[PDB]
Design a protein around this nucleic acid. Structure first.
Lengths: 134, 184, 57, 144
RNA sequence: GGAUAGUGGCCUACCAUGGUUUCAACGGGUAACGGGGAAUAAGGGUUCGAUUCCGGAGAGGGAGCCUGAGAAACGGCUACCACAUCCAAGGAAGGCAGCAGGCGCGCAAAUUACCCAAUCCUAAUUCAGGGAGGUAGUGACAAUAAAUAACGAUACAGGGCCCAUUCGGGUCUUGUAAUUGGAAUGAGUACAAUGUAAAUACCUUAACGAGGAACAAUUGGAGGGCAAGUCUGGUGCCAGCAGCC
């Protein structure tokens, strides 16, 4: 807000993904670092295009601070933005809801067990129950 | 797996560990240029030997050789970029006889003492190591920076540095606040 | 001779003397500056051979 | 003609003569015969662990008269017995019994160092703790 | 002629002692995978190359094979030797030199974590998977710049220097304090922050954070090679030191 002076370089528009790509630069003295959501809000309020169509990531701060350089993406529409953006980036932005999956070790263990079990398995469960009953 | 990342040494130990004259020379040089180790002298001597070997291998080739002309032009261009060679003499004697004294007196830490920004070599050294130096819009804390005459118009203190301004300092704020509280 | 003894003789019979408390020495560039000052700019003893430990005569 | 053949086609003669006369060099012969891997006590290795066995009635070289101990050690990988020299003052505290000691060479690539005749190795570690650590009292050998 | 996908003693019938060899054949050894390739020179180069790339080989060793475009495939099958995963004693079934990890072997080498996010792979494939790979832990194998501090009244240890009222003032300013200070910062606790979806490691920030019995630099330790201890105690060819003397 106080003389951040967000600026953009190497702005190239590709209709192939219907987006515009650039390297963005922020000159923000007396700051820790400019957050990506704050950058998105600034780009939205200065371009009057869209809120969720602006992507900013990377953002290394120069040694001694005061300036940061990162990568920025703007999208033709929110539909295309959600069609092309990575799921992790969308979730980190908050545009997407996080998935509920177990650890990879548990998933691989489960795949091993269900490759050991052939078919549906209900017949095996019923047979085991009857064997216990007898 | 991944391609290896090449790493090279930057210094060389003398062949004789205890030469009285060499030890006196190195200690005097490091005392007058404010160096922390003989490894700095070793590094600068290493690059000096590297460039002298380059010059000798260039003079190896016949006169008016395209590779000789190109490579000599590149080496002299870098030497004048770092600013040691004459801007109007292409006589190459300095090229064949650059000196450790020249390299250190060109190095950054002594540059501050030469231009008069710290008035002491060690005070300079401690200023760079405490990062109150900015060659441009960037802050460097390395004494061995070897400025290239280009930032001379732009040398200043950082705006995120105390005694550069807009900030009292970690102990300055405490001392001023306690003085104000005591004075009432 | 009767010399079936004294394995570790002097190390056992030496007196335990503790290192005296003295101020810390400078480390790094400060130590090198101290050496340079004590070596060159000083004129303590340059008469015969510029010796480094001027023992009492 | 200075001995050696000089003809432009005498390269085979020169190579064969050099091959024959390389063998007069002490280190080349050892390297090409593998004497380190066949008859060196350490098997061509920098260091070797061992178990200290007993006392032997040996005498030091000039000038002294000292018969207390010099550690006979049985190596683990070879099973060979070598005499090692405990390299510091106060040797008594570390030679208790059946200890495991790490041995290095004396530095002369397989030869005795000084006034100690027939000893080519020294001790650096006693049961995994460094001998000069015990000598300087900065670490303690395992007493429990 | 057969077999091969194909030439060919690769094998079958007849015909010679034909083929190699001191220009080193054959045999033996290699603590020998080969090459690209570290360490030096305008040429003496001597070693090493298990190892990031390429070509080989192997999946405990030999042998045999199915499927398959492609395999003599061993995280595919068929047969022993050391070894096993087991009972309720009839069995079923063979070797992590893939990643972690364990035990022996040793002088000698990491965690039984995370992720398909950055790079590539596969037919039915924009969506799946990958211990390939990346990341996170140990790590002083190496490699880069580099914290350990910068100044006042006083004297002392006294470079270059002046005022012709002979240690007075000292212009410029080399260093030291057991008597003392308005000046600059690193290591970390951390909400804030990133190439991480929930994160400690890198510079940024409220706060805590410097006074030297603080947050403390070691390793070799001064005969010669290679400068300096005849300054002080203990032993007295003894303990020991010493790569050589």
């Amino acid at each position: 807000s106080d003389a951040v002076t967000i600026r953009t370089r190497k702005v190239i528009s590709n209709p192939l993904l219907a987006r515009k790509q650039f390297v963005v630069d922020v000159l923000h003295p007396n700051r820790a670092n400019v957050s990506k959501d704050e950058l998105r809000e600034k780009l939205a309020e200065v371009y009057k295009a869209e809120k969720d169509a602006v992507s900013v990531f990377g953002f290394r701060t120069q040694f001694g601070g005061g300036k940061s350089v990162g990568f920025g993406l703007v999208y033709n529409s929110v539909a295309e933005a959600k069609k092309f953006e990575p799921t992790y980036r969308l979730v980190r932005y908050g545009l997407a809801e996080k998935v509920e999956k177990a650890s990879r070790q548990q998933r691989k263990q489960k795949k091993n067990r269900d490759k050991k079990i052939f078919g549906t398995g209900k017949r095996l469960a019923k047979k085991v129950a009857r064997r216990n009953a007898d | 797996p991944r391609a290896p990342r090449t790493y090279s040494k930057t210094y060389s130990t003398p062949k004789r560990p205890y030469e009285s004259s060499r030890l006196d020379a190195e200690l005097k040089l490091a005392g007058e240029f404010g160096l922390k180790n003989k490894k700095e002298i070793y590094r600068i001597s290493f690059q000096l030997s590297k460039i002298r070997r380059a010059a000798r291998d260039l003079l190896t080739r016949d006169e008016k050789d395209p590779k000789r002309l190109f490579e000599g032009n590149a080496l002299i261009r870098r030497l004048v970029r770092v600013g040691v060679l004459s801007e109007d003499k292409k006589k190459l004697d300095y090229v064949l006889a650059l000196k450790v004294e020249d390299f250190l007196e060109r190095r950054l830490q002594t540059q501050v003492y030469k231009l008069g920004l710290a008035k002491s070599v060690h005070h300079a050294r401690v200023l760079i190591t405490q990062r109150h130096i900015a060659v441009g819009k960037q802050i460097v804390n390395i004494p061995s920076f070897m400025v290239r005459l280009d930032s001379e118009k732009h040398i200043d203190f950082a705006p995120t540095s105390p005694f550069g301004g807009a900030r009292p300092g970690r102990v300055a704020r405490r001392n001023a606040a306690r003085k104000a509280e005591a004075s009432g | 001779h009767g010399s079936l003894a004294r394995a570790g003789k002097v190390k056992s019979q030496t007196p335990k003397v503790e290192k005296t408390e003295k101020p810390k020495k400078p480390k790094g560039r400060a130590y090198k500056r101290l050496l340079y000052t004590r070596r060159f700019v000083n004129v303590t003893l340059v008469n015969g051979k510029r010796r480094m430990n001027p023992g009492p005569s | 003609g200075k001995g050696k053949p000089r003809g432009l086609n005498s390269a085979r003669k020169l190579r064969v003569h050099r091959r024959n006369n390389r063998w007069a060099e002490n280190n080349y012969k050892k390297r090409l015969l593998g004497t380190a891997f066949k008859s060196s006590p350490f098997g061509g290795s920098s260091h070797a662990k061992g178990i200290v066995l007993e006392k032997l009635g040996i005498e030091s070289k000039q000038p002294n008269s000292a018969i207390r101990k010099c550690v006979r050690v049985q190596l683990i990988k070879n099973g060979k017995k070598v005499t090692a020299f405990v390299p510091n003052d106060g040797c008594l505290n570390f030679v208790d019994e059946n200890d495991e000691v790490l041995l290095a060479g004396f530095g002369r690539k397989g030869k005795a160092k000084g006034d100690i005749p027939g000893v080519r190795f020294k001790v650096v570690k006693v049961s995994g703790v460094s001998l000069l650590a015990l000598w300087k009292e900065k670490k303690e050998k395992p007493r429990s």
